[PDB]
């Protein structure tokens, strides 16, 4: 029996866990994924793998999940360990909900699946989840939020960040470019777009190839949107007319 | 060897490594030996010192009013088929309200030490056993071992250099059923003694001697007590 | 219920009455009680409607696979014995009397009691509400070694006299007969009763 | 007597990947082909069932199975497996069905069955699924298909292909399928896209074929298929 | 409840009123009370509401997954010990009546299985609190082999019977023909009663009821 | 690259990188290894079961050595691999078609009970700590409904139905053999179809043997209970080859 | 004729030529046990043993290898003597469950397939191991008549007229053949399971042996229990005698 | 009676193109009133309404699972919940309490998300499902309810005239009742706009 265990929760004789590092690699061959926090809301803006001229495009998003009524997730990885974490997501958030009557605060949602997956490194000699997860929301503590999830089960708390593929260049893209307390949603879009088409592998963009939800407080209700293709195009485009005046 | 880290692993000889791995633990204790006659079952066991500061081991422990045991191998793994032995002893009077014959006790220890031999994870027990006691049919010795296998004899010798007390024996078998309980135990200390490395002899420190039959219950004499059995010595000859 | 089974030389006769009651209504007036537990094992059914069919069908259960098992024909004493287990079991949750009656290579035909959870074997045995009112009638009724045609009228008989005494029996009188050949299934209607003294 | 082993048989290898999924994959790369195909008014499902002797029954076993009145199913891979996410499959239908009192989402069912393939890339003493499931399915006036795959991950299509030869059935699908066809045109381009893998003549015995609309999910008769293999 | 069942010459025929009581207030005037089990197997429930509606439901829901991994016709026999050993189980507290009846390869079958899961098989019966008013009638007119309309005739008067003579039965006779060729389910086959018309109005004029407060979302 | 392993992949019931399973693939292997050849085949009116059956000498008791077995009534099997697995199999069978009439009523179908079966060996394909069964089982019997029905069932978990099959050593020689038979459209009678798998078992193995070397069952539609035909019987059709 | 490393550690696991060298490795453990012999008779069965004595200073009747699994059976083992006395204590449960459920005495086929089931099931998973003996079941009554079982570490079970198990299970089996035991009564047949265990002993290889010897048929009312210290003795002489 | 306790009345009705419910606003405990805003009817999506009456403890909590559960759905499902479903859904919720039940007769009203149609229903305490074509009731004056609803209700009536008759049936059939009472409240549901008032009701 021990002949067939692979001893996923040991210890490595650096002190390091072995499956969580190589869960970490998983998540650079999926999608770049990117949040970025602005003073008047929050988005993410993905990279869709699913592609092809043979897709139906039946769900409103492809790796933006809705899990409460104040708060949204991006996903990078293995998608059916990504399906089961949300799931658990839209429970916690909904215990939270039942027993306090009041919607659960961002950071104390993102914590409590961390601790889950930082159980699956601990014990139980289960494989651990190979996702990152991206988490926007707004709370009545610390208004609009933007959190990272780790497959190690630690999190943090960015103003802009990024998982996935080419990641490091896309944050170090954005570090220069983040204007710190002086972004808005309109600046954060125009970023986005910005980031993800150097980064990306296609080269010109497309709004079949991207994937941008907002999150916003209008009306004293949380509003989350999905972006619209006709939304993304004008996106899009406005970056590439700005790629046409940079040259004399 | 990839045949003999666990117990389910059969080696293509047809045999289990692990058991005889256990029956090693018994033959490194020291010395023990059981005999009986048509009355009285004596058991005769060498007290050992890992230094001369410290005491000496228990060899000999109770089990009833009419079972006695005598231990060799691992303490842990003795103490507890000890409390087994003592739990069904137990059970037998509380149910019945008579003694548990020794046929049967030994039995469940041979059902019982087969177990573990058999599942993964699990482990054979390091200790072998000589069973002194009284019922109904006499007298008995007995002996078991890490195997669940156990024999019924009329005299044995178990642990480190038993092989001479077990000719010994051997040789006055037929002497033993009309012995005198006095001469039945000096024939148990005799054979002890052809253990003992020439230089050395029986102390009235390492000696530990049980006794159980038609006359007693099972009584465990020691240090002072020990000596009048000592006394009265045919000398170590060669 | 009436229920009733007769020992005879080549097997058994098993009887029972048409009804079924639910406080002084009858609901089905129409029921056979004689339920099949092997090809020439059956057993009579009184109590419980509920509890009665639930032993039925596990009694059945439990032959069928001992049956296969020793690749031979299930004893009627081994028959019994299952019915006889579960209601032992479940005494207090169970509320039910099986009278199981049939015939084997071993023993020849046998009936069996099997009340409460004990077993004895009879050369005829009564059971059921309407038992009562023909326990004088059985045992001054009764010859020992009775053909198959006395048998079947001797259960007959009884069973008559008992459905037009008892509130709780009624309807026609289903008679099954087991023997080394097979099972021969009767039914005796209303215009075809045995009559007696009726004022 | 017995007790599983607790621990994962899919791990994560160095380079980040879970080698068990993959070997799965190629379990269902190498089986029978099947394709399905989303037809505007209807789905089509047919797959290869050349069981290779004259010997066989054919009408004993199917690979297109029905999971209630509006949804259907094909698989590329292992039979035995198949069979079993078919049962669960179904169990899962009714579940949903005595809740709601509604036929359950088409896409609600494959979330449900992809999540059960999840469990075994990660529960204990068990290998993942070597089979990929081609899911129908007709609710709310519009036609359904979906793939569930051993790594628990599904995806929706207007048409696809799997098994042998799914690469050159895929571009083949690419070039020959346009949206909005007939239901009746979909099952030609469904027995088509067969024909490119075949390997032998085809007879109605040979392959099988399934199909949903609004009227529920059936499988074509004998007769049927053989008006179409003309 | 006032539910029956009836063997003819092609087939089987359920009946049932349309009548829910809670307390002694009619509930619903229009429940229906004939369930679906297989296309050609059905059940009529009596007792406890939604005991009558979940075992149904729940039976129903193991016969099609049943029918599905089998590819066959659905037996009856199947429905009813399934039905049962469920009943059986829960030692009558699941307060369902049933009357099961449907066609199979072995012919046409009409069962009734109480809550306590006895059970038994009849050409004609009766459950429910005005089964009395409906066996009356069966007894008094049954024959062996009639035909579809001589057999949905009394069946109609049976539950008709039950409807006029019990005050926990009223409304629409459902009538289900089931038939080794199909099943017909004539929701409101025969009505009774009849008083939807009327003569006395009772409007009021918007702002005949005083308000305090008002508030308007707008979507 | 055909036949490449990794791993543990060749020890327990996980994937290669092919995406096979060894152990599944040895387990057909043990049933080579019972030394025996099974053929069933399917007539219009019945279906017959036969085998060899060797009895190394005269201290063992004849009628104990078997390879016939009873599940139903109406349904029987011939079991072809390791004895002591075939026999668990059997008894899980049996076990499964009392229980499929204790909750549904009637009598298991052929196919169902197969089936059953199938779904049992498939769990010993998934899990990883125990092994398949060394065993092959071949169902017979008739269906109310369908006529008569032959169906077979593996360690990997596949089950079909069929109008004639093999099963052991010479499996692969006789349904060649019973290839060539089915092309040319015979009457299948009782006698053809019995005779069809006797004359395979005995080509292919060539013996021509005693009535005590073979066993034959049969399952017929006037007689649906499930026949073991003894030494007369079996002596009646084997002198009825020779005339 | 063995696999190393891989394929014949676990039970669970199969070699690449379909065999379970985990099973074959514990019935080596019984080809190396002293000799077990049981054949029926006319009107029973006997069983004859030889129990090789490791040591004068055991009891003359210890490690039994003759047991009572229920009052009309008898049970003879062979192999490791441990798991031996578990599968008696396994089979004891069988008949005494039978009776229980049925209430009668269990019929010897019945009993020797049930027993057969649990000992194949030690055979299927890496949690536990084979058990390393091989066993025979013989057991007499009027309706029945004479029957004789054996099984075996893979879980096969037959029926027999003659049997043998341990080190010359060959030497024995052709020294059966010789007797017409269809014909022969069960007095007879004590003589001459006597004699065969003598021929089969090897008194050149093992130092010495006893003879264990049981009945169970018409003479002892269909009980299973041990031949008289006088019939043996006469048996042991006869067996001496003929050896010229 | 154990419905007894707490009192209360939950009104559903039906109109053209439109439907109607009404809650009194009291909390009581047997022989006192201790809150005159008490709520009894919860928002389950724009445009669907569930109205519970009984165990004021039963109704919140009940009230708080279904959210949990109907949450759930939408978010699992892509959709909003159709009056069906949400029906069957709290049938499930309360069957699952079949012997140890929730002590609330829920009433559901609304309009079909997409295709517009007005659906009523009311529910057992063991979840049986009522739909009706004109009015359900539930709670300690069913009688009265049923006795207003026969006599007031009509098959087509526009948004003004439904609202006057379905409080015109409460405010009377509360006036009755010594449990219910404290105010009135009534929803009135449309397509466009969701219409909400408190009425001048009796305060004794
Ligand atoms: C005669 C006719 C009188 O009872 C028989 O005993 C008959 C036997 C029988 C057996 C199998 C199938 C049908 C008929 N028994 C009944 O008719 C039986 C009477 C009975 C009811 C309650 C009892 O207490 C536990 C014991 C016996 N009738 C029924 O069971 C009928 C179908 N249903 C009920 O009466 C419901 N009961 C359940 C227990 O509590 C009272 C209501
Ligand atoms: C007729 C109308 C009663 O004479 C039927 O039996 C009918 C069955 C039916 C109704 C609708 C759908 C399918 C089948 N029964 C009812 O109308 C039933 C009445 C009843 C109340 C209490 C009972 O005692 C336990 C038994 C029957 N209706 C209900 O169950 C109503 C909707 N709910 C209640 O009365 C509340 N019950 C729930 C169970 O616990 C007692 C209180
Ligand atoms: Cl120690
Ligand atoms: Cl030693
Ligand atoms: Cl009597
Ligand atoms: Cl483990
Ligand atoms: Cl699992
Ligand atoms: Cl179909
Ligand atoms: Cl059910
Ligand atoms: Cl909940
Ligand atoms: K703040
Ligand atoms: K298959």
């Not at chain 5, 009529?44 to 075992?55: F, K, L, S």
């Not at chain 7, 891989?6 to 514990?26: I, K, M, N």
Request: with cysteine.
């Amino acid at each position: 029996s021990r002949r067939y265990d692979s001893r996923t929760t040991i210890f490595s004789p650096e002190g390091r866990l072995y499956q969580v590092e190589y869960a970490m690699e998983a998540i650079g061959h999926a999608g770049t994924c990117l949040g970025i926090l602005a003073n008047d809301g929050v988005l993410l803006a993905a990279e869709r793998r699913n592609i092809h001229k043979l897709l139906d495009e039946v769900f409103f998003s492809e790796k933006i999940y809705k899990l409460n009524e104040d708060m949204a997730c991006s996903v990078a990885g293995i998608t059916s360990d990504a399906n089961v974490l949300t799931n658990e997501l839209r429970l916690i958030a909904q215990r939270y909900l039942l027993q306090y009557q009041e919607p659960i605060p961002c950071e104390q949602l993102v914590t409590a699946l961390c601790d889950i997956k930082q159980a699956y490194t601990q014990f139980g000699g289960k494989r651990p989840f190979g996702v990152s997860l991206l988490y926007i929301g707004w709370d009545k503590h610390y208004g609009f939020q933007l959190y990272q999830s780790d497959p190690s089960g630690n999190y943090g708390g960015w103003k802009a960040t990024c998982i996935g593929n080419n990641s490091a260049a896309a944050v170090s893209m954005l570090k220069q470019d983040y204007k710190e307390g002086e972004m808005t949603l309109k600046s954060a879009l125009a970023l986005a777009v910005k980031v993800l088409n150097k980064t990306m592998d296609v080269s010109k963009l497309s709004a079949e190839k991207v994937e941008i939800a907002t999150l916003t407080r209008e009306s004293g209700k949380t509003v989350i949107r999905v972006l619209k293709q006709k939304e993304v195009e004008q996106l899009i485009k406005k970056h590439e007319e700005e790629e046409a005046k940079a040259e004399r | 060897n990839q045949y003999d880290n666990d117990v389910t692993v059969w080696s293509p000889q047809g045999r289990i490594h692990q058991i005889e791995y256990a029956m090693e633990a018994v033959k490194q204790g020291s010395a023990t030996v059981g005999l009986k006659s048509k009355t009285h079952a004596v058991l005769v066991a060498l007290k050992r010192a890992q230094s001369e500061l410290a005491a000496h081991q228990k060899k000999i422990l109770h089990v009833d009013n009419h079972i006695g045991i005598s231990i060799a191998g691992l303490t842990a793994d003795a103490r507890l088929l000890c409390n087994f032995m003592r739990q069904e002893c137990l059970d037998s009077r509380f149910v019945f309200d008579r003694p548990l014959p020794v046929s049967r006790l030994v039995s469940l220890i041979g059902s019982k030490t087969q177990i573990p031999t058999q599942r993964y994870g699990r482990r054979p027990y390091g200790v072998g056993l000589l069973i002194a006691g009284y019922d109904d049919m006499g007298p008995h010795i007995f002996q078991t071992c890490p195997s669940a296998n156990y024999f019924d004899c009329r005299a044995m010798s178990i642990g480190a250099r038993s092989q001479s007390a077990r000719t010994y024996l051997e040789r006055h078998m037929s002497e033993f059923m009309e012995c005198n309980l006095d001469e039945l135990v000096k024939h148990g200390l005799r054979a002890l003694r052809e253990t003992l490395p020439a230089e050395q002899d029986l102390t009235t420190k390492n000696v530990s001697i049980g006794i159980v039959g038609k006359d007693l219950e099972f009584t465990i004499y020691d240090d002072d007590d020990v000596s009048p059995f000592l006394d009265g010595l045919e000398e170590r000859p060669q | 219920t009436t229920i009733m089974a007769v020992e005879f030389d080549g097997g058994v006769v098993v009887g029972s009455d048409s009804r079924v009651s639910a406080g002084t209504a009858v609901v089905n007036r129409v029921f056979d009680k004689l339920s099949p537990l092997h090809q020439r094992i059956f057993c009579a059914l009184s109590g419980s409607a509920a509890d009665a069919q639930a032993i039925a069908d596990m009694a059945a259960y439990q032959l069928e696979l001992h049956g296969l098992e020793l690749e031979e024909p299930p004893l009627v004493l081994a028959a019994a014995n299952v019915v006889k287990n579960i209601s032992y079991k479940y005494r207090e949750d169970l509320l039910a009397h099986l009278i199981v009656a049939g015939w084997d290579q071993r023993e020849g035909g046998q009936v069996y009691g099997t009340m409460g959870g004990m077993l004895i074997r009879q050369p005829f045995t009564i059971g059921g509400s309407g038992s009562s009112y023909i326990y004088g009638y059985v045992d001054a009724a009764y010859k020992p070694g009775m053909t198959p045609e006395e048998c079947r009228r001797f259960t007959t008989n009884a069973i008559t006299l008992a459905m037009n005494r008892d509130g709780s029996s009624g309807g026609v009188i289903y008679l099954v007969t087991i023997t080394a050949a097979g099972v021969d299934h009767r039914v005796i209607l209303g215009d075809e009763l045995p009559k007696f003294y009726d004022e | 007597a017995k007790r599983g082993y607790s621990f994962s048989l899919t791990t994560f290898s160095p380079s980040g990947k879970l080698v068990q999924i993959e070997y799965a994959l190629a379990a269902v790369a190498g089986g029978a082909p099947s394709v399905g195909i989303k037809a505007a008014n209807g789905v089509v499902l047919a797959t290869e069932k050349k069981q290779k002797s004259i010997l066989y029954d054919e009408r004993s076993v199917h690979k297109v199975e029905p999971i209630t009145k509006h949804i259907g199913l094909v698989y590329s891979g292992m039979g035995p497996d198949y069979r079993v996410l078919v049962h669960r499959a179904r169990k899962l239908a009714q579940q949903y069905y005595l809740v709601y009192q509604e036929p359950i989402p088409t896409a609600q069912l494959v979330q449900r069955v992809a999540s059960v393939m999840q469990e075994y890339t990660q529960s204990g003493g068990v290998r993942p699924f070597g089979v990929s499931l081609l899911i129908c399915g007709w609710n709310e006036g519009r036609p359904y298909l979906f793939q569930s795959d051993p790594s628990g991950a599904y995806f929706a299509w207007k048409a696809t292909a799997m098994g042998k030869n799914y690469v050159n059935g895929k571009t083949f699908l690419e070039k020959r399928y346009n949206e909005d066809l007939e239901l009746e045109d979909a099952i030609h381009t469904a027995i088509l896209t067969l024909k490119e893998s075949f390997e032998g003549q085809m007879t109605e015995d040979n392959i099988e074929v399934g199909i949903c609309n609004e009227a529920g999910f059936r499988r074509l008769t004998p007769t049927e298929v053989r008006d179409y293999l003309a | 409840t006032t539910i029956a069942g009836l063997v003819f010459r092609d087939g089987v025929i359920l009946g049932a009123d349309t009548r829910a009581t809670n307390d002694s207030v009619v509930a619903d005037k229009s429940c229906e009370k004939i369930h679906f089990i297989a296309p050609k197997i059905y059940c009529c429930g009596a007792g406890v509401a939604a005991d009558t509606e979940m075992t149904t439901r729940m039976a129903a829901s193991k016969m099609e997954l049943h029918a599905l991994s089998t590819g066959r016709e659905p037996r009856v026999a199947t429905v009813t010990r399934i039905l049962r050993q469920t009943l059986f189980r829960y030692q009558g507290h699941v307060g369902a009546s049933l009357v099961v009846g449907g066609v199979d390869l072995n012919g046409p079958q009409l069962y009734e299985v109480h809550p306590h899961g006895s059970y038994s098989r009849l050409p004609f019966t009766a459950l429910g609190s005005g089964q009395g008013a409906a066996v009356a009638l069966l007894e008094d007119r049954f024959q062996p082999n009639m035909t579809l309309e001589a057999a949905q005739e009394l069946l109609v008067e049976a539950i008709t019977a039950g409807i006029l003579s019990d005050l926990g039965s009223g409304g629409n006779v459902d009538a289900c023909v089931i038939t080794a060729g199909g099943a017909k389910l004539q929701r409101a086959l025969s009505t009774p009663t009849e008083p939807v018309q009327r003569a006395g109005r009772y409007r009021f004029a918007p702002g005949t009821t005083p308000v305090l407060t008002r508030e308007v979302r707008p979507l | 690259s055909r036949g490449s392993s990794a791993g543990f992949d060749r020890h327990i019931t996980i994937f290669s990188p092919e995406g096979r399973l060894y152990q599944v693939e040895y387990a057909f292997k043990a049933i080579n290894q019972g030394g025996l050849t099974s053929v069933a085949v399917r007539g219009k009116d019945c279906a017959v079961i036969v085998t060899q059956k060797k009895v190394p000498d005269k201290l063992l008791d004849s009628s104990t050595v078997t390879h016939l077995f009873k599940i139903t009534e109406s349904i029987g099997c011939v079991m072809t691999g390791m004895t002591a697995d075939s026999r668990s199999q059997v008894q899980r069978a049996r076990y499964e078609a009392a229980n499929w009439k204790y909750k549904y009523g009637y009598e298991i179908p052929v196919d169902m009970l197969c089936k059953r079966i199938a779904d049992i060996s498939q769990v010993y394909t998934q899990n990883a700590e125990m092994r398949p069964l060394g065993c092959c089982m071949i169902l017979i019997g008739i269906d109310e409904e369908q006529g008569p029905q032959v169906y077979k069932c593996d360690p990997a978990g596949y089950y079909c139905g069929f109008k004639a099959t093999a099963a052991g050593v010479k499996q692969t020689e006789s349904t060649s053999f019973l290839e060539k038979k089915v092309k040319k459209k015979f009457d299948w009678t009782f006698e053809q179809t019995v005779e069809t798998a006797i004359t395979c078992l005995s080509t292919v193995l060539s013996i021509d043997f005693k009535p005590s070397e073979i066993e034959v069952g049969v399952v017929t539609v006037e007689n649906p209970k499930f026949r073991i035909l003894t030494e007369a019987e079996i002596d009646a059709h084997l002198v009825a080859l020779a005339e | 004729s063995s696999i190393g490393t891989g394929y014949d550690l676990s039970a669970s696991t199969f070699s690449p030529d379909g065999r379970v060298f985990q099973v074959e490795y514990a019935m080596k453990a019984v080809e190396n046990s002293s000799t077990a012999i049981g054949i029926r008779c006319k009107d029973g069965v006997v069983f004859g043993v030889e129990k090789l004595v490791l040591s004068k200073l055991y009891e003359e009747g210890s490690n039994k290898r003759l047991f009572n699994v229920d009052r009309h059976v008898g049970m003879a083992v062979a192999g490791l003597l441990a798991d031996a006395r578990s599968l008696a204590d396994i089979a004891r449960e069988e008949a005494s469950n039978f009776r229980s459920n049925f209430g009668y005495n269990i019929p010897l086929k019945h009993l020797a397939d049930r027993v057969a089931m649990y000992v194949h099931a030690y055979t299927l998973y890496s949690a536990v191991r084979p058990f390393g003996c091989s066993f025979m079941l013989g057991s007499y009554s009027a309706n029945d008549g004479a029957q004789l079982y054996m099984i075996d570490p893979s879980g096969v079970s037959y029926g027999y007229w003659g049997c043998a198990i341990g080190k010359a299970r060959q030497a024995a089996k052709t020294e059966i053949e010789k007797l017409q035991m269809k014909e022969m009564t069960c007095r007879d047949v004590v003589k001459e399971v006597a004699k065969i265990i003598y021929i089969v002993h090897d008194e050149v290889k093992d130092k010495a042996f006893e003879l264990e010897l049981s009945w169970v048929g018409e003479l002892t009312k269909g009980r299973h229990e041990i031949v008289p210290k006088d019939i043996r003795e006469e048996a042991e002489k006869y067996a001496k005698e003929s050896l010229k | 009676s154990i419905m007894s306790y707490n009192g209360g009345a939950v009104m559903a009705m039906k109109g053209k193109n439109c439907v109607a419910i009404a809650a009194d606003r009291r909390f009581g405990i047997q022989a006192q009133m201790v809150t005159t805003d008490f709520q009894k009817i919860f928002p389950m999506g724009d445009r669907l309404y569930i109205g519970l009456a009984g165990l004021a403890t039963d109704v919140q909590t009940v009230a708080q699972r279904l959210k949990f559960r109907l949450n759930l759905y939408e978010l699992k499902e892509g959709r909003q919940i159709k009056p069906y479903t949400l029906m069957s859904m709290v049938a499930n919720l309360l069957y699952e309490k079949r012997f140890g039940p929730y002590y609330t007769e829920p009433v559901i009203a609304g309009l079909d998300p997409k295709t517009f149609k007005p659906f009523i229903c009311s529910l057992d305490l063991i979840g049986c499902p009522m739909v009706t074509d004109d009015f359900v009731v539930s709670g300690t004056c069913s009688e009265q309810m049923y006795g207003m609803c026969e006599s007031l209700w009509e098959p087509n009536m526009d948004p003004e005239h439904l609202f006057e008759t379905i409080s015109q049936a409460m405010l009377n059939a509360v006036d009755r009742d010594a449990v219910s009472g404290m105010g009135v409240i009534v929803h009135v549901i449309e397509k466009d706009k969701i219409t909400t008032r408190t009425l001048k009701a009796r305060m004794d």
